[PDB]
Amino acid sequence: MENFQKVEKIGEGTYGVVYKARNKLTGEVVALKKIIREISLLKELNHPNIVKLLDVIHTENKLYLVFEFLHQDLKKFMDASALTGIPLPLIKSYLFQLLQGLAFCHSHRVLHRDLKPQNLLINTEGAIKLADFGLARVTLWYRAPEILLGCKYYSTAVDIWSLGCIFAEMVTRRALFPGDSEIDQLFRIFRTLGTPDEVVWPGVTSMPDYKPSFPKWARQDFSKVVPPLDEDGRSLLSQMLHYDPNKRISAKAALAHPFFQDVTKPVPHLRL
Ligand SMILES: Cc1cc(N2CCCS2(=O)=O)c2oc(-c3ccc(O)c(O)c3)c(O)c(=O)c2c1
Fold this sequence. Notes:
Elements: E1 4-12, E2 17-23, E3 29-34, H1 37-43, E4 53-59, E5 62-68, E6 72-73, H2 74-79, H3 88-107, E7 120-122, E8 128-130, H4 145-148, H5 157-172, H6 182-193, H7 231-240, H8 251-254
The protein binds the ligand Cc1cc(N2CCCS2(=O)=O)c2oc(-c3ccc(O)c(O)c3)c(O)c(=O)c2c1.
PDB class: transferase
Keywords: serine/threonine-protein kinase, cell division
Assembly: monomeric
């Protein structure tokens, strides 16, 4: 609506375009996403670790979603600190907060479906928030195997897999499974975690796109996956990456993992 004055074009959203804008009325700086019963619900999905949806505006087939604005995203923060790496305390805080945000959405039956560094926003207060939450109901690097294998009614576990991939990237400073096509993505997972079978994943051989012809890769020792992360960390990650969605640790249980024992809330140094 006319009540806004775009300040600059942030980025291309997986649904449309996102602008930094200012409300003439409230005088508040916001994020204007250019694109119903599904978004409305999302307005009541409030939590400190979930980017707030301020308003929804529908007009002439044009849909606008107004969100609180944050200055930087996790992807941009990882590139600018890839030579020095993000300190463990911060990685642990971020992971602990993300799991909090997730534990809340899930407790309410809302999946993100497409978590990735770009949609994780941070501020100078050391807080990180989930962006584009619930909007699903091009990167494939954070997509869970069951999704890739054709499961149509996948669960909250898919978000856990994505966060697990992200957690691994912060530690090593390189994408875990950098797929450039669905088959390449699926095979990259297989080559690290081992081709799944009925032993570790009951039901895998009956899934829509599974094939008795998939190559049989061995599971690589986990200590070569994300070094030099400590045991509490490798233990948590392995559970976030279990093949079977029913076995994959939930957000709630992960917050109880010993890894968060010494969890604090440091602040990164932003250079807005
Ligand atoms: C520096 C930067 C980059 C991005 N973006 C990261 C990738 C999408 S974006 O370019 O908007 C971004 O997205 C969203 C956002 C929230 C919810 C949603 O549904 C969106 O579509 C976008 C914000 O509130 C925000 O403050 C912000 C800031």
